[PDB]
């Protein structure tokens, strides 16, 4: 193996990466080895040959994030009485998850997003949280 631009199938490296970025945004357990290897997976996706899959990786990360805070939101308002404590639990998980996933997506942030209208994954995850869990719940959250 080497750092040269190689060809990677997106649906395999992204499938390996999704089980990690699902388990780091929820503050589940992913070991040091897997977390380190996901950095090489992100790099190999961002400099893939001959088409860099940075745009597809960012698109699917955004889609996963908007499919996660949507699930968290559906988990929030279903507990109407305790939406405050459920929101606090899910936000405490999701803030650290967004920070860790911004750490994981550093190459995509500093080599694709900053070159290109696009929000960095640390900014995107919070912006996905505001537009899908805070603003829909701003009537109930601030009231309680």
């Amino acid at each position: 193996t080497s750092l040269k631009p190689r060809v990677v199938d997106f649906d395999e490296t992204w499938n390996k990466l999704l089980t990690t970025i699902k388990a780091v945004v929820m503050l589940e357990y992913v070991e040091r080895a897997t977390w380190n290897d996901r950095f090489s997976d992100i790099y190999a996706l961002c400099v893939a040959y001959p088409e860099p899959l940075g745009e597809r990786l960012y698109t699917e990360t955004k889609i996963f994030l908007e499919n996660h805070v949507r699930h968290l939101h559906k988990r929030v308002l279903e507990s109407e009485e305790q939406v405050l404590v459920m929101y606090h639990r899910y936000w405490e998980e999701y803030s650290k998850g967004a920070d860790y996933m911004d750490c994981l997506y550093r190459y995509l942030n500093t080599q694709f997003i900053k070159k290109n209208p696009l929000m960095e994954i640390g900014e995107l995850a919070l912006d996905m949280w505001r537009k899908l869990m805070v603003e829909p719940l701003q009537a109930i959250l601030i009231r309680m």
């Binding site: 499938n15 390996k16 999704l18 089980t19 699902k22 889609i63 996963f64 499919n67 949507r70 699930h71 701003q138 009537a139």
Partner: protein, 499 residues
């Protein structure tokens, strides 16, 4: 107040003074406005909609009610516009009604409502709701109607449609189509109708088909127009293959005249929905083996590695009856031509006599005979019209060819509507297989998930294709349960584990 604030106050208080005078007369009575937005959008009052959008844009929680109620209005308008369609011209009327609703509600949004992105998203949501609208406990109608719309538009029409017609109607069809949330059924129907148009030459022009395939590619990626573009390229290279076959036969060591013609249509196996469904144990007729063996040799020596599985049911042939008196020229299908050769050596034929000649099963030989005798070319020699062992048929010598183009190909030339349910079943089975593979990959990747989270994941990776029904995903979970691949967790059935 904006003008007056410039005249007197410091610039730093240009905002607060106006903002504080918003949160007294547009936000203290916000609910009042929110109690009436409905009417403002139900009658489409342009001045009132513009004023209300300008008013509620500054208020933090004012706009979302207007967005939601505009979405509701557009959804109700779409339901009332695309549910009273006549069954005669339904494929055109559905697309035209959705098109005109989209045009009206983007002209209203772009000018009166300043074209806010949230309002366009509400329009998209409402049009997605009206396009994927189905009768109670019934399948969706958008994919079939839109595929039939493209099939009727791109076919050779007697209305004299110009190239600009298919250049503009299809371009607007892309806008209409992007709202189908069940795109796989449309993909398979367009593949089937494109195949039936390509094999029979029913298409208006190959340039129009290429433009349509490119438009669908731009709409939905390359995996959508993979099989379709491969079919189009096969039809584009069939002529070059026929020219290469002519060069091969004229460049042989011994000069050989084909006799019969050979306008071969080579097709890729994966791309084309045409499949060898029956046994099709039809022996090649003697007059065709000379070309068949030569084409097998050519395709084995010029393109090595491509096994050529013959489909002896889709091939046509210009047949003539020399014993009848050589009347004009007749076009039949190969699937029965062998029994016609039986009429060469016996004026009367029996099913036992035909069975050794055509070598195929009689379960379709009977219907080919029926499609031969309905034009009175071949008459019933015996009396037993039912399927019997003897079942004599004779050559009707009194009836000559009525027209120069004695076309029996019209049985296959027209695409029957009885195969629509078969295509639906094929789409359903392929959908089950694709969802099974995707959920196997998901279960082998994660191995820890909840049931509602499983549904969320299923729709997450089904975003790129059809959306899955909740009962359908439940049935998929059941069939995984009874396949020794997933099992109910001991703690609860909500948790699932992969072995």
């Amino acid at each position: 107040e904006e003008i007056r604030c410039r005249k007197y106050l410091h610039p730093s208080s240009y905002t607060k003074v106006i903002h504080e005078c918003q949160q007294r007369m547009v936000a203290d009575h916000l609910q009042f406005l929110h109690a009436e937005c409905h009417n403002i959008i139900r009658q489409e009052k342009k001045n009132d909609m513009a004023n209300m959008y300008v008013l509620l844009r500054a208020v933090s929680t004012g706009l979302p009610h207007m967005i939601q109620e505009l979405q509701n209005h557009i959804h109700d308008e779409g339901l009332r516009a695309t549910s009273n369609l006549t069954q005669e011209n339904m494929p055109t009327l559905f697309v035209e009604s959705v098109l005109e609703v989209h045009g009206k509600f983007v002209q209203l949004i772009n000018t009166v409502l300043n074209g806010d992105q949230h309002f366009m998203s509400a329009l998209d949501k409402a049009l997605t709701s009206v396009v994927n609208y189905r009768e109670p406990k019934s399948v969706c109608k958008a994919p079939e109607l839109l595929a039939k719309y493209c099939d009727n538009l791109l076919k050779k029409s007697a209305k004299g449609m110009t190239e600009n017609e298919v250049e503009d109607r299809l371009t607007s069809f892309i806008t209409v189509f992007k709202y189908i949330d069940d795109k796989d059924v449309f993909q398979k129907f367009y593949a089937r109708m494109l195949a039936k148009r390509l094999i029979h030459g029913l298409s208006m022009s190959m340039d129009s088909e290429e433009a349509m395939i490119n438009k669908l590619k731009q709409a939905c990626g390359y995996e959508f127009t993979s099989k379709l573009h491969r079919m189009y390229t096969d039809m584009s290279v069939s002529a070059d293959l026929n020219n290469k076959f002519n060069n091969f036969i004229k460049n042989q060591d011994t000069v050989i005249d084909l006799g019969i013609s050979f306008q071969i249509y080579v097709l890729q196996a994966g791309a084309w929905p045409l499949t060898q469904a029956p046994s099709s144990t039809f022996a090649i007729p003697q007059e065709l083996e000379k070309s068949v063996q030569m084409f097998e040799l050519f395709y084995s020596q010029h393109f090595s590695g491509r096994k050529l599985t013959w489909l002896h049911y889709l091939c046509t042939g210009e047949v003539k009856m020399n014993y009848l008196g050589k009347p004009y020229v007749a076009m039949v299908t190969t699937y029965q031509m062998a029994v016609l050769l039986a009429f060469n050596n016996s004026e009367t034929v029996s099913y036992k006599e035909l069975q050794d000649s055509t070598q195929m099963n009689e379960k379709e030989l009977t219907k080919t005979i029926k499609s031969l005798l309905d034009v009175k070319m071949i008459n019933h020699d015996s009396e037993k019209e039912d399927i019997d062992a003897e079942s004599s048929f004779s050559l009707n010598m009194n009836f000559s060819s009525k027209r120069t183009k004695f076309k029996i190909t019209t049985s296959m030339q027209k695409d029957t509507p009885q195969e629509m349910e078969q295509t639906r079943s094929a789409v359903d089975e392929d959908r089950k297989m694709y969802l099974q593979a995707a959920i196997v990959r998901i279960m082998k990747a994660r191995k820890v998930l909840r049931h509602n989270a499983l549904i969320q994941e299923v729709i997450s990776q089904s975003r790129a294709r059809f959306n899955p029904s909740i009962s359908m995903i439940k049935k998929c979970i059941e069939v995984l349960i009874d396949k020794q691949y997933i099992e109910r967790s001991q703690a609860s059935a909500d948790e699932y584990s992969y072995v």
